[PDB]
Amino acid sequence: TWGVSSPKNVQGLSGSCLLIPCIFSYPADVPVSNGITAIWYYDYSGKRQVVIHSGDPKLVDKRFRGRAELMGNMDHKVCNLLLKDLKPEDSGTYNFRFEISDSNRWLDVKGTTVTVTT
Ligand SMILES: CO[C@]1(C(=O)O)C[C@H](O)[C@@H](NC(C)=O)[C@H]([C@H](O)[C@H](O)CNC(=O)c2ccccc2)O1
């Protein structure tokens, strides 16, 4: 019962900040010996730019640096994403991924679509 659940659609005004509520889950029998890495991707099937990367921010795309931050407690299985200072180009799909081990990792196939308005 691996899974990720975040809203299908979210809306925000340009210049404003927007939060994407998110929670996830995985089997109680999976050992977690090195924490959980959290990663949010923008337009995964297109440009696939990294929005947030808890294991190493250097992987974060330059256009999202300083404008996106993770408001999630990995221990409580919360992956809320906060996007600050919204821009028209931020419109698109965001998909969350968490990694516990080489084989125990997961990418949400659904994802959340953001729409930025004037
Ligand atoms: C693609 O390979 C992996 C992965 O995400 O690294 C291997 C990983 O072991 C596996 N995790 C588990 C617990 O089975 C993982 C997982 O099957 C996928 O991330 C699930 N998501 C999707 O199937 C998917 C497919 C298309 C688009 C987006 C997501 O695939």
UniProtKB/Swiss-Prot annotation:
Detected in lymph node in the subcapsular sinus, interfollicular regions, and T and B-cell boundary (at protein level). Expressed by macrophages in various tissues. Highest expression in spleen and lymph node with lower amounts in lung, liver, bone marrow, heart and skin. No expression in thymus, kidney, brain or small intestine. Changing residue 97 to L: 10-fold loss in affinity to sialic acid. Disulfide bonds join 22-79. Coiled coil: none annotated. N-acetylneuraminate binds at residues 44, 97, 103-107. Disruption phenotype: SIGLEC1-deficient mice are viable, display no gross developmental abnormalities, and exhibit only subtle changes in B- and T-cell populations. However, they are significantly more susceptible to bacterial infection than WT. In addition, serum IgM and IgG amounts are greatly reduced in mutant mice. Induction: By interferon-alpha. Residues 1-117 form the Ig-like V-type domain. Macrophage-restricted adhesion molecule that mediates sialic-acid dependent binding to lymphocytes, including granulocytes, monocytes, natural killer cells, B-cells and CD8 T-cells. Plays a crucial role in limiting bacterial dissemination by engaging sialylated bacteria to promote effective phagocytosis and antigen presentation for the adaptive immune response. Mediates the uptake of various enveloped viruses via sialic acid recognition and subsequently induces the formation of intracellular compartments filled with virions (VCCs). Interacts with CLEC10A. Belongs to the immunoglobulin superfamily. SIGLEC (sialic acid binding Ig-like lectin) family. This is Sialoadhesin. It comes from Mus musculus (Mouse). The gene is Siglec1.
